[PDB]
Point group: D3
């Protein structure tokens, strides 16, 4: 999949495209409707399916450091776009271009001159141009004859509007199950594993993996979650009895540095391993409990054992729910 930063990086000999445009933060189920429609039309006419997206977040251009939390990193947005069949992503920076352009010139410059589009797919909530004057309705009238426009309704399901906003609200409440339901997959983060408390292995109380994430990353509320930890493909040696590319059952503690840097510390069920130096994916399945303070090692280990018990039950159920479950996983029936 091609990735272009700014209109000037798009190949001049681009022949034809079907285009979808949006922030696409999270690539949730509504976003997938736009992408699927774009891919389908591109196939039909023998064109490239192109996503136009935005980095930095358009809100951050007006209100620096008050933009919405990123449901996914830009990199994972690319990975998700590719997985749903996008052939190219054009990333637009509103501090560089297209911020002060009229709706008419926006379409002329972006859709026609740059992308040579024959079809554009946008959500009902789409806006564009100076002071957000262009709407989904405007785009339909501006693109009369010149190219076909498919405006897709926002997705309402089980009485909830699926949007980046609603996914962020679920995460903030610790309702990862509802977040997952709206995303169409397990919410996840990926990152390197650092040195933490003790060394991973025989001690139940030392995490298998310690990670830190910056305060622009959307994470579930502080607490303990059932989930799956996967060591991403690697030839580096692994300390202990975990293999790369397998989803291992884990109890995951999300915390906040006492400093809004967040910690994600994973306790892998029934395994003795230390994952320092590896890149790992952590997917969240369900909430287990709120954070609490411990007054003794005995009490700490007791609560950890209960976390393991409930995690095992939640994950045994997740494996059945199954469109989301991992293809290759490890979960023991008991300790």
């Amino acid at each position: 999949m091609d990735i272009w930063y700014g209109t000037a990086a798009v190949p001049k000999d681009l022949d034809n495209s079907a285009v979808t445009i949006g922030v696409f933060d999270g690539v949730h189920r509504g976003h997938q409707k736009l992408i699927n429609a774009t891919v389908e039309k591109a196939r039909e006419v023998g064109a490239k399916a192109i996503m136009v997206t935005f980095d930095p977040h358009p809100v951050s251009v007006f209100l620096p450091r008050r933009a919405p939390l990123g449901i996914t990193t830009l990199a994972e947005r690319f990975a998700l776009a590719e997985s749903f069949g996008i052939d190219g992503v054009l990333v637009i920076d509103f501090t560089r271009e297209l911020s002060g352009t009229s709706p008419e010139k926006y379409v002329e410059f972006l859709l026609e001159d740059t992308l040579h589009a024959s079809h554009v797919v946008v959500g009902a909530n789409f806006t564009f141009g100076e002071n957000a004057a262009g709407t989904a309705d405007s785009l339909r009238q501006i693109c009369q004859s010149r190219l076909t426009v498919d405006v897709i309704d926002l997705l309402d399901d089980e009485g909830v509007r699926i949007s980046s906003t609603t996914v962020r609200e679920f995460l903030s409440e610790g309702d990862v199950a509802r977040a997952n339901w709206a995303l169409g997959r397990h919410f996840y983060v990926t990152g390197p594993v650092v040195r933490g408390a003790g060394r991973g292995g025989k001690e139940l109380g030392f995490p298998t993996a310690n990670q830190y994430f910056h305060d622009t990353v959307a994470l579930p509320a502080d607490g303990v979650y059932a989930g799956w930890l996967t060591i991403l493909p690697t030839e580096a040696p692994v300390s202990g009895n975990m293999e790369p590319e397998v989803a291992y059952a884990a109890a995951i503690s999300v915390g906040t540095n006492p400093d809004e840097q967040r910690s994600v510390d994973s306790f892998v069920l029934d395994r003795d391993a230390d994952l320092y130096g590896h890149d790992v994916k952590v997917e969240f399945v369900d909430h287990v409990r709120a954070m609490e303070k411990f007054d003794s090692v005995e009490q700490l280990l007791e609560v950890m054992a209960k976390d393991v018990q409930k995690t095992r039950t939640l994950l045994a159920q997740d494996v059945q729910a199954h469109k989301m479950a991992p293809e290759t996983y490890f979960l023991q029936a008991e300790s």
Copy 2:
């Protein structure tokens, strides 16, 4: 108007004075009663009207960094004193002098030896001398024969006690209208304009002016306010269509750095300007709304347009209320 720092800076040949003594933070309507009485008596007897005030705040001498927030800067206290007819301000630093003096020696040294006063005006709540032993009643008895004393009742109006404390409470609640009512003018701050989000001009979403204030400055609660922005007299060129010395209608967003440094970002109605490098006065008129987070540029601009609508209405009313309104102003009837 003369400004003296410490008793030693007062001219030795000072002939005669009528004196008022207090912190005078805010120079609110009660303070104005003390000042007006002092100016009147000074005129009658051909004397100088002198304010004795205190910097740092007397509370900060005992409890550093727990003094009350400054309603105005010391500099603006001077400007306000001058505007009500004070001829000289004596600024006393309790870390340097007069902290451990008996009431008797306080009067002897300050009022007689230093200021050569024939009249003193104080509020009913006045205290002085070591461990605050001197009261308004004490001053009357100590100054028998030697000089006349006028003790003025604290101001109660519309069932509220007008004091620096009550003004601070109104500001903290976001009730700038009540603060203004107690002050007898629009609450304001002045400062240099810095570089902020984007550049001021055609974009409705970029502030016309970005400012920052230290955490010792009393400001209204975080939120959006209707008010007036004035570029103070200057020969420096101005980017865009604002002229110096005119009060321009503005929607003002008061925020807090996510760090208790406060931001004041002003969106000037119907103008396209960037005020970087200029000193500006921002006066607050009324509360418009609480702060909120924005999930899209469309939503942000929508709320900003509603802020403008309500600001225009509040300011059209302010112009009529009129003892406070600015003498030279710009406010369009519509966008």
Copy 3:
């Protein structure tokens, strides 16, 4: 009293001991039951009475920077142990040894090989060995024949469980009287006195002593307390009219730096002194009031005088309660 850090520092020719094992944070009334039983048995058999304790806190090994607040410093734990008749303290660091040992090998290595114990005294809640598998019951069965075991019930009195946890809860609520009741003494801190607001002496509003404590130190909730300040033995000269080794009546303000560094500022009743450079012990007796903000020096001094009035009453009562009262004290009947 001997203090050994780690098993390797214990004398190889140690002949015989009666041992008690625990964190012992606070050396509260329950802890004293364990210590008293250990001292008694050691005397009976002509052995050394040994405390095995832990630093860092065992919880901090698993959850760094989330361990419980220290009721006392390690140093004061030593001082308290000595005062109840302990002959030696062995300090174990679980990052260095005994963390991953089986219960059987824990007893073999620590109690037999290192301490040559003939008797061990533990609380009903005692655990030991890898993943806390050893209990008070396990210890009894493991030590069959080899050495006698006395397991002492946790102390319940007046419907409260006396534990380090309950003492910490009382302190956090500002209930120093209940904390004191559980400890069997006045809760106290000791530290050097630094330069603070003004200089101690004639001014009622300047503290006699300013102190700061790190955020790992358990202190009562922010507010004002009645208590006793003692200058610890010293030949250094003392500014003002306080003598070393006398408990002086004081109103103590506990605060928090606006930074979780805590301040303890003591206003010594009826004394004029500045304690810069001295080490001082501050013991808490009862809560007087919550913290408040002051808008004037008059108001500040008024509240301070009321603090003195209530402090004098609370301390006059404390002197009668008397098992805790200080042996040598200064408290005037009136100002």
Copy 4:
């Protein structure tokens, strides 16, 4: 003078203009040659004299926080351009536009479509377009009359923003001033320091951010002016008069810079006012003091030396202020 941020801010009805282009940092004597040529032409033809300049500094776009120190602020660059008769400044941000463009489309977009220029004045070192391909040579060929002006050499010294920054960093403010064609200055609010009659408390305390070019740490002779204000002044100073001053430039150790001004023969405290400090000559390097007696002695010597140096500056009145206060002795 108008100020436009970006090409889209420029009025569409701009009928005609004479344009000069450059960073113009310091608006030194070489820059004045370009501006003077641009203004003379415009006033001759009744057209607007336009300066195209750059913020952030073009280097900082490639190397953030490794750009050269600002000889003046952008605000003072506007003030100086206006003082030399420029009618409009267009400020270009290379992170927003005119970066990836070729020389051909740079000239078409900027000079023709945006500014409708009939005349353009540039330095011999001028470059433009992607990879700095465009040169003063490349501009001439593309038609719009083009005046290319040699870089200024005087007394064997190349006058450039670089050579001015060198003089300042070395503490040689006299040479800096000679290259600038005026006294180097900074302007800013006065903050609280230590308050007067006492010789050792500064009349004014100021701090500056680390991107501001200042002379090397040391003591300098200069002039302090209170900028026009109706606000009251504590002590015996009046606004809009240049007062003789010994100026101590320092660094906050363990690079926020301090500029503390001791005004000669005046007893005043300038807290809250905006003040202009112009530097005339170097007096001495920084030193540490072990007693008050020593400090006050060296300060009296700073004053003596300052009087002499400023007396000379007044006589060679080309750069001296028009209304000033300076006593011959205490």
Copy 5:
């Protein structure tokens, strides 16, 4: 290869082993002599080749934050040991064990009870036990065949972790590489910088913590490789190919280090990928730039010099990468 943290992590059923012991920082050519001897023996006897190493660095236990800079990370130490055929690494933390022990009980506890060693390979400088009393001499007497290998001297230079750190600190990466027996490298994620087609925006921006040994600030010729990934790549680079690159090493002033790579003749942005940067030779010391023209000119000269140096590296292909991209000219 297995990795065991502490003696208690080692399998109890470890029947037999050939062991080498040391800090092994950098796994330089002297270290390879020890590892090669340990591996040859084990493969001969069908036993496990074991490396006992130390984290934290033994010096840091006595002098926290005064330990020598890490030539490689502990992770790269594992990767290198595995590359030379080591079957297990035992990592010892001296704050947990083997510190207060005598030489006798060190050997008994570590080599006999834990590793069941029949052969041990150590450097002539090896010491152990409390107060570094144990020596290579003291090890021989205690029976387990012991091979003590002289420290490596080549071309009149002692090859040690110390001499490698010296070469790096001086900017002499060529000599560092000669002592290492490979190109010195670092690996890490690429972060955001300034985004391409523009020569002056780096292809990849990286930062490193202050315990990482890096060459002296300056510009170096090297190779950048995108580590194996299925993630998409922006621009015309493929994973697992070594691309020619001019690498600028810098320091965040007022010691976080930056490593910014300008990949020759490629237009790409490697944000979010993990990248290996190997250093071949020094090009130039750091310098400041006063214009874009100057910056781009020096960058073109960096590219020219880099092409030449890398051409030489390719020819002397002992340390050169197996699959690489390098153009003879623009």
Copy 6:
């Protein structure tokens, strides 16, 4: 000894006194001449010997955070004054009083009204009143008998707070001690470091703020004393005995100072105790270590050198401690 903060704290019924005035930082041998003369007179006449001193340092009032480093703390200044027989110290804060006053009213307010002095002893360098106008000369004329004592010169060296600070900054503690008339020392609480029997873990770890004068970074021979306490001591040290020690002075890089004491032939941990560290002579400059073997070797050499130097100090017993512990060998 009484301690009064400000003139208003002094008892009104103070009937008579002999006064000395000065900063008295370090209470060096020149200061002792003034104090001795003041005490002898008072004890002769049965009056109080009074020292008027200054906090903050008078320089810091003019130049905050540019004052000279404190040779001792104010607390140790009180302790030293008391040790030389001073009956009261009056501490003057120049930001509170005696600043704007003339020489005449300074003497009237301080010496007559406040202290009721019949005798005053000052150094030849003494100044007072606004702008340091008052001198030792100006004091004599104003009647109160006045003894002005020359500054101390010995072995061709001027003994002053300045020359003591110079010796310390250079690492020449022997010369500092000679000028002081005692071993230079600091006192403070011992904090946690790395815990013993191990030679390389310090017996005591301390930190000091950046206003404390300390010798240059390096290793020194000295004595460590645990100050009187009933608190238990871990290991084989007793309170109130001076133990031989190798003392490492260091700086927290990227200026908090460390003082880490390795007590000879003792196995102890002094966490939580207050400790006095006195410096006798310089052993070596700081160096970096690349191995534990090297570190322990140099530490053994530090111990050997320390034994020799302290043996000499004991013999020339004028500055040596009265009760000490020092072994001739391990």
